[PDB]
Design a protein around this ligand. Sequence first.
Ligand SMILES: Nc1nc2c(ncn2[C@@H]2O[C@H](COP(=O)(O)OP(=O)(O)OP(=O)(O)O)[C@@H](O)[C@H]2O)c(=O)[nH]1
Ligand SMILES: Nc1nc2c(ncn2[C@@H]2O[C@H](COP(=O)(O)OP(=O)(O)OP(=O)(O)O)[C@@H](O)[C@H]2O)c(=O)[nH]1
Ligand SMILES: Nc1nc2c(ncn2[C@@H]2O[C@H](COP(=O)(O)OP(=O)(O)O)[C@@H](O)[C@H]2O)c(=O)[nH]1
Ligand SMILES: Nc1nc2c(ncn2[C@@H]2O[C@H](COP(=O)(O)OP(=O)(O)O)[C@@H](O)[C@H]2O)c(=O)[nH]1
Ligand SMILES: [Mg+2]
Ligand SMILES: [Mg+2]
Lengths: 442, 442, 48, 430, 430, 48
Amino acid sequence: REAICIHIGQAGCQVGNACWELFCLEHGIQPDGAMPSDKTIGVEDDAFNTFFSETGAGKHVPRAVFLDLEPTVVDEVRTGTYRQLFHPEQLISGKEDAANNYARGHYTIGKEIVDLCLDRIRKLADNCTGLQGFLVYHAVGGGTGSGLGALLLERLSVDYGKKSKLGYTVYPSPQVSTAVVEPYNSVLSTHSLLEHTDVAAMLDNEAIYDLTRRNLDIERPTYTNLNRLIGQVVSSLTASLRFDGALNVDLTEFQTNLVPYPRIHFVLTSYAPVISAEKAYHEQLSVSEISNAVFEPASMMTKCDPRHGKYMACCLMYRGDVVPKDVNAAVATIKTKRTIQFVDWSPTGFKCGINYQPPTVVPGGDLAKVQRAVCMIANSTAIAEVFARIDHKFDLMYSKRAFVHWYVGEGMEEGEFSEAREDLAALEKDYEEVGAESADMD
Amino acid sequence: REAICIHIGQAGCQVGNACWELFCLEHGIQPDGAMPSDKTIGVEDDAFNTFFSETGAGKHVPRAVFLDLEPTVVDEVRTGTYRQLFHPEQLISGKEDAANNYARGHYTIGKEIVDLCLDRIRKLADNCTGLQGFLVYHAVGGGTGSGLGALLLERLSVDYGKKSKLGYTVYPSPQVSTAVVEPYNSVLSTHSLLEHTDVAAMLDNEAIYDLTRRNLDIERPTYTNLNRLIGQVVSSLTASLRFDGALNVDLTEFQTNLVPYPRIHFVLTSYAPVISAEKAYHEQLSVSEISNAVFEPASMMTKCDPRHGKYMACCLMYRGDVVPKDVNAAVATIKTKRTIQFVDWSPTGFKCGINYQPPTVVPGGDLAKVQRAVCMIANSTAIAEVFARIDHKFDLMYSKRAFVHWYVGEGMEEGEFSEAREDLAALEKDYEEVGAESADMD
Amino acid sequence: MCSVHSNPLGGSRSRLHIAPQIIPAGRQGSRDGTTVRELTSNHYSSGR
Amino acid sequence: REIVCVQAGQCGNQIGSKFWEVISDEHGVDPTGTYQGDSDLQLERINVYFDEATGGRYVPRSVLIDLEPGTMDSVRAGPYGQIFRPDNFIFGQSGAGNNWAKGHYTEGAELIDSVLDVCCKEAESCDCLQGFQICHSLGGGTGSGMGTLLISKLREQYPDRIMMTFSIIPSPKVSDTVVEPYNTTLSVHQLVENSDESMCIDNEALYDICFRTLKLTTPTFGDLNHLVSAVVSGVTCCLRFPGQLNSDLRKLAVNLVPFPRLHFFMMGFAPLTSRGSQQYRGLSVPELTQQMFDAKNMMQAADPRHGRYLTASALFRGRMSTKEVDEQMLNVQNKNSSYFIEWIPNNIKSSVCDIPPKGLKMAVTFIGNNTCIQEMFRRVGEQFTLMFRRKAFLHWYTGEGMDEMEFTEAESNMNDLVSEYQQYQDATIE
Amino acid sequence: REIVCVQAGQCGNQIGSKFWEVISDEHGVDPTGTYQGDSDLQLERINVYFDEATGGRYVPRSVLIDLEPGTMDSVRAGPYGQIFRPDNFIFGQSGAGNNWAKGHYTEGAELIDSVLDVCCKEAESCDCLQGFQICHSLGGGTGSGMGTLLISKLREQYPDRIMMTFSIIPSPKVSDTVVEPYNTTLSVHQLVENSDESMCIDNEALYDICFRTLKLTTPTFGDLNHLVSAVVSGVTCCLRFPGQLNSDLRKLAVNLVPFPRLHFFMMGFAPLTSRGSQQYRGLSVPELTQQMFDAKNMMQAADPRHGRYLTASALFRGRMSTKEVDEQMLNVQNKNSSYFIEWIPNNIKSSVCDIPPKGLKMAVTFIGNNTCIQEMFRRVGEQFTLMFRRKAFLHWYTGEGMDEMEFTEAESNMNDLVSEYQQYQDATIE
Amino acid sequence: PVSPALAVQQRLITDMSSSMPLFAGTAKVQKYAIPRYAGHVPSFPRNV
Ligand SMILES: Nc1nc2c(ncn2[C@@H]2O[C@H](COP(=O)(O)OP(=O)(O)OP(=O)(O)O)[C@@H](O)[C@H]2O)c(=O)[nH]1
Ligand SMILES: Nc1nc2c(ncn2[C@@H]2O[C@H](COP(=O)(O)OP(=O)(O)OP(=O)(O)O)[C@@H](O)[C@H]2O)c(=O)[nH]1
Ligand SMILES: Nc1nc2c(ncn2[C@@H]2O[C@H](COP(=O)(O)OP(=O)(O)O)[C@@H](O)[C@H]2O)c(=O)[nH]1
Ligand SMILES: Nc1nc2c(ncn2[C@@H]2O[C@H](COP(=O)(O)OP(=O)(O)O)[C@@H](O)[C@H]2O)c(=O)[nH]1
Ligand SMILES: [Mg+2]
Ligand SMILES: [Mg+2]
């Protein structure tokens, strides 16, 4: 039933604004937390409970924290339109940023802020009766997102233990780039994140830019569009908790079905009817068409080509007016295709979910309104190509110690670079070994 | 049941406009794709399905793609009257033309655009359940028609395999000409077309001009008249799929009946009651007179004289109020004539079709309204004269390599000219050998 | 404006429909009243 | 004694539709399936062609097969189409391509198992099964290939019963299809081994019947299919009504076939006469016998004057004296004695049935076994030999998979059948 | 002679709700619990499934168990949900996670004492206890693991009664869960030791039933669960109504199981037919018998034509002659004699009950013991061997605590079950 | 008061967008042509 959201740094807070806008509009909570008197129900219902709690006077308040080291974005939330929705104590802000240094966030500055965050998360977890996981939003390219996200996940993993923690992560794009030191921060983040997360979903801004140029007709996209798409994805994945359906899906079954070996937990995400309003009325959108679409690389939100690898598991979430027989026929048709390949040790490759609530349309939004949608999370060996280019850029800079004095001044041993680079080398070798066919039957 | 239309270049798109205006007017679809809301016939018959698919809101959309390298013609379609009929993705346009170079279309420029075309054709073919062929419209005299027609038919022939491909093709007229380099493009086109087409329909602009001068009384014809006549012919051949009748003819029956040997697939087309409104009320129009008409040389839409050859097979399509006894009496009367000769290895020379739907009248049109019509497609050795004249013009130009430096600079080996010229010479020898009359008595 | 969704394919809880003025795109599925108890119990559909 | 009908291809389904119209009319069954007849004699043999469904209804025991549902949709849309059982309509998704090899080998084997399953379900419900009845054309593609395939399967599964076929064969004049000789030769090769008795109809003979005898100004396929439905419904009349000298399909086979390969017969129906003239001349057995032997009333292009009768049978419907029947058949055999094969002492079998078709006082259907059928097979073999020497369209059939040896075998078998007919025609006794 | 029902997991609770709808309808029980029936035949055996609460009411002897209350909240909101006793709903606070080891070992041992306490309270209240009835899926997590845990405890506590299960098993074409082979293998290992009779259903077979026989355009899980509830309520009909030849679950077991390991059966229910076709065919014992053996009407993907029947049972409901039943079962055994194991002189048991379900004149449910079940187990064992060689997802199960030796034992036991079916298939008299 | 007509549905979502000034000079804002248009479209209100 309940889930707690943790938003870290700039990308995570900005994506949080779009997420909570969407969750409000789907349940019908006004921006000030008061349910309108007209939104009546024939019978008493609980679906909001996943994301909101009531104080008893009937105000709604959400199960989230906003964490940042710079004030500006949180002060923007405090002075914006949603001022009354959040509890003011929940919005925690420091004095100064981690300046693109993982070392500054992890060692110097986050060490002061981390205990307030832990006290807030404890205060949330005490007001629950069926907590079933954490959702975390951050980017690994910047300093505070990497360093404080790792430190906070470590503390959560010791205090709460077995409870599942699912991360949504913005990785450095393969040729669009924003800062010079991105490879170092992403490697050092990924080293800590490897041990202390159950599934990690990867996003690249270049893919969402391509998707908004190609499918939508947007020449000049901006971060609000990307954040609204991410919010739609999160709403699709969490819809299985909130509404009636034929095949529900709890967050622990994702971890059980998608992860074959404990290090092999990085997954690809895609969404089918990303379409504009003018195109949407010229075409039918049957189950088999959107099922064929999600396997095409034109549907993906991460810049990787799955034709260069093998699938291990797929999880397909259908929401809206869909009937199971068409899902079964579609998956059997996908299985027939010759350009889609599964590793021979994974014969039962698919997980299905079916929910009756169709995707919501947001007034300022750019997606059309549609009766059905499907969302996919999938595990594939193609991801090894994504790590190899980051490792190559790391090797290029590190061969000459290009920036290391900043990291060493803020508290880090030089040895930590070599350890992380060796761990990522071992992850590459794991992806080489898992994909090798077993044919020694004699 | 279903057929997919592919329109390439300028002639093929302009003929496509006439085709889809006509097919709309026969079914009754408004230019915006919506069925008339005040029409209550109740028998919502399936006949549209051959050419249209439904979105579900009751809009109609057509099974076609428009392919061009220059924007202007597709922008004319985008800004015209039929804007709402086509899906915008279906209308594909490049940046720059193939500049009358087959080599430019095939090697340099079409190679970038071709993958979008294949993705659209796949998206159409996936939304079918009894696809029974492709209809292709292009001219072989121009650069994009030659280069993209060859490249696209080759790719379609590998990917789709056994599915039939029927082309309607505008060839360079025997003395009317539009560009200097027409012989080179026609030779290079015909080399590819030999391997990768199931039936080829032959057209010459001089014949349709002569037909519009002699039967209609038009001194100053323009392309809209020719394109409306071509659209009527295509509607006559595809009418057998769409309406009830006494003797139906499936598209595979054409290939079985018309093609004796796998290279001898180039066919002549003619149409009988092409008549003006003022003449139409002075004459009865019985079956036997129009059957005699389709065999008169004043009726053909290709500039060839059938008195210089022998027929191998004829396919006669009757539409409208016709009775089988009149068809049988007419065919027996034709068979009696001494100036009509069939090869001695083809004793049962005729195929018949009889359809109940009379030809449609177009509001701006110039043809009269008539209760019956007949359309003929026939295989005859006379076609060898058209190739001989193209090859002679090629030999005159090729003796000095008159323009070849453009083609070699734009990417083609000089050797390809000699190969193609030898292949068309072999096609001439095939038509010489098949027309041999031999005595097995020996 | 908001309304309440119907439950044609199952379910028992009410669902919220947001902005009914915007007409959804895509094809609506084919539906009929033919169910499995109408077939396995109503043999008296015709009183011949 | 119940018959199961199979209708194959466009020609077969349309003639079958007209046949079920004629039979449903004769037993007074409404198109809703309700009995509305006016005599117990109609009800007492309804089981022969109809099965009884619950609460009054009757359903016709027929299987319809085609490769595109266009014909199936046309017959289901017809005025009596509703009577047919929905589960009995079998169709595919792609055509025969007018190609025998496609219809027999590629799309045939895919659907054929479902047709045999339906035919067995229908056959095993009968308390005692009589022969099967199949209507198809030999010149087509799915008609020829799947008709002969189904005949082979039913002959393997029910070898002790009767196999009856009504078949349309290409006219020498009406060329409706270019590849007619191949399909005809392969189909006759299958039929002469598999069939027990096969009836052949030329469209040209029906056209000449309509224009000369009935003087119709503008005939249509409804008239030709009505004439065919009349003879088809007439041959079985003695199976399902009383009479002074009953007859049966097996008794017809035993009296008409001297040797097992000589089982191809001509058909005729006598009281065809225009509505204006009929008031001036009453029906009588001399008049019926005169129309019965006039070649104008025979449904084949071959003329009896070029051959000899081995055997013939006449089935009379109506209230009439047996004496007139006996003396007419004796007088016709004695007066035209040169055209009857002399080593059989009496060539004509007669049968009398009490119930005539509605609106006629009397009627007879005539079935004749005459050697002139050899001229038709010779014509088909000629067109095949002209076409085969030049490999005129063979690549389509070879692309489906046929070995060329099949064409030479089928040609050889047809040539031996023509030779055997000619040998018994010109035999003599010294 | 009263049965106690247990419903476990999502599939089990959903099928159970529909089953109790069907049973409450058959005995005329209002959703308030008041008896409103219209014949004494309904009342005189109401005790079999219901207990009587004070002032009129009846309560159904069923225990509902699940690890997350979502399903229970859905069933409680349904139209009949109120009838269930509040104390009979047992639930935890976190899901099974689709993991057998979690469902069996961690939350299983936490909840199991309260379910056993409720089951004992219900059992010791009976004056004479008949077998238990359990509904669950084998591919899931809490259904398979906790269902088999509870089955083991009840078999320890009541070893002299019968234990009967209805079970849903993974389709051959598409998986709903990635780790299905492990959960299925471990559950079959538990069942083959503990169970007396186990029934198996493929969701693919129900889809093919709906599409081919009923021609439904848009079937839903409600239809599949209605078919299952129909067979489940049909098997017990002879326990609770009069008839000419009474039968009982123990009598079924004695006639169906030749050897104690061979207890896995196929199910079918006959008068399935589409609303368009129903006007065309009346019900009769030959029609039901012909449809009953058609593999189209069987609720598993394996087809009888690849195996042989050891034994079969047919339970008929309705007013009918015994002569038609015995002679039909003889004729079917004689005509298909190669498909019946020859060292048993008669393979089919029949039973006849006077009272059909409302609105049907007659019905039969079919239970079959056929060797083709070996193909399903072989397929599951293949998928297990592919997954197990690579330790594909094993760390979850080992982290809960399972030894790999359990996996090797379960694989060996399934392989021996397949071998035993194959050995009895190819046995001979010699 | 949104009408259920097709064109109103096609352009209603575009009209309410929060990034209207950033669409100037593109093919979306030209109401007289279908999207992915190729010809010139002005970017100043006097020309528009
Ligand atoms: N999709 C998306 N990406 C963003 C957004 N904001 C920043 N990014 C990307 O994330 C990376 C920058 O990470 P930041 O979030 O700015 O780093 P930070 O958490 O602020 O860390 P500090 O700079 O030390 O405060 C770059 O690749 C940006 O393109 C956003 O709102 N949406
Ligand atoms: N019937 C008809 N013929 C046309 C039409 N337009 C051009 N042609 C003929 O087709 C040939 C020219 O081919 P084009 O279509 O112009 O070549 P293209 O496809 O535009 O190729 P590019 O020049 O490289 O763009 C000449 O013989 C013209 O007479 C037309 O609209 N109708
Ligand atoms: N008498 C009659 N002949 C027909 C009819 N329809 C088609 N034919 C003839 O049958 C032949 C065509 O065979 P067809 O039925 O099309 O073969 P199919 O394609 O296998 O079904 C030609 O000789 C047609 O003239 C009909 O309704 N009545
Ligand atoms: N027939 C039927 N099958 C179901 C239903 N619900 C789930 N299933 C199937 O059961 C399997 C999933 O098992 P599940 O009940 O979710 O296991 P659980 O998580 O332990 O409760 C899949 O094969 C589903 O297709 C239902 O209502 N009816
Ligand atoms: Mg920052
Ligand atoms: Mg051009």
